[PDB]
Design a protein around this nucleic acid. Structure first.
Length: 59
RNA sequence: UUAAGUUAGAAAGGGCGCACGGUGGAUGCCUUGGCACUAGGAGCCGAAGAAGGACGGGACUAACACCGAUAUGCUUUGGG
């Protein structure tokens, strides 16, 4: 969370994209019954929310 | 033996009493909820989009509660 604040906005924006790609893949593996560590999904969702919160704070 | 006479007993089923069960949810005890007030506070919300909703959000989610595509939560300050 503080580590996110060390990054630039553009750098944060890139981290979001990466997390959204990850979240999509998790949901895809979950659907095909190949996930196992199902707790990752919640982690990633929160992370994305954290990014978007920091960015909105910047403005 | 015959005759005359007398009287018993009987239960297909039923009645009364008793015993033991079933059904049913009265009664007692209990209280998650109510009822009436007192003292203080507060007496408005809305185009900066209200009241009230609909549909969604969880690993799996039918319902409730919570939340809004940042969705079963995000940041921060304190408490613990």
């Amino acid at each position: 969370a503080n580590d996110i604040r060390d990054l630039s906005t553009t750098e944060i924006q890139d981290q979001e994209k990466a997390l959204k790609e990850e979240l999509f893949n998790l949901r895809f593996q979950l659907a095909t019954g190949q996930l196992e560590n199902t707790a990752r999904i919640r982690e990633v969702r929160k992370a994305i929310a954290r990014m978007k919160t920091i960015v909105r704070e910047r403005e």
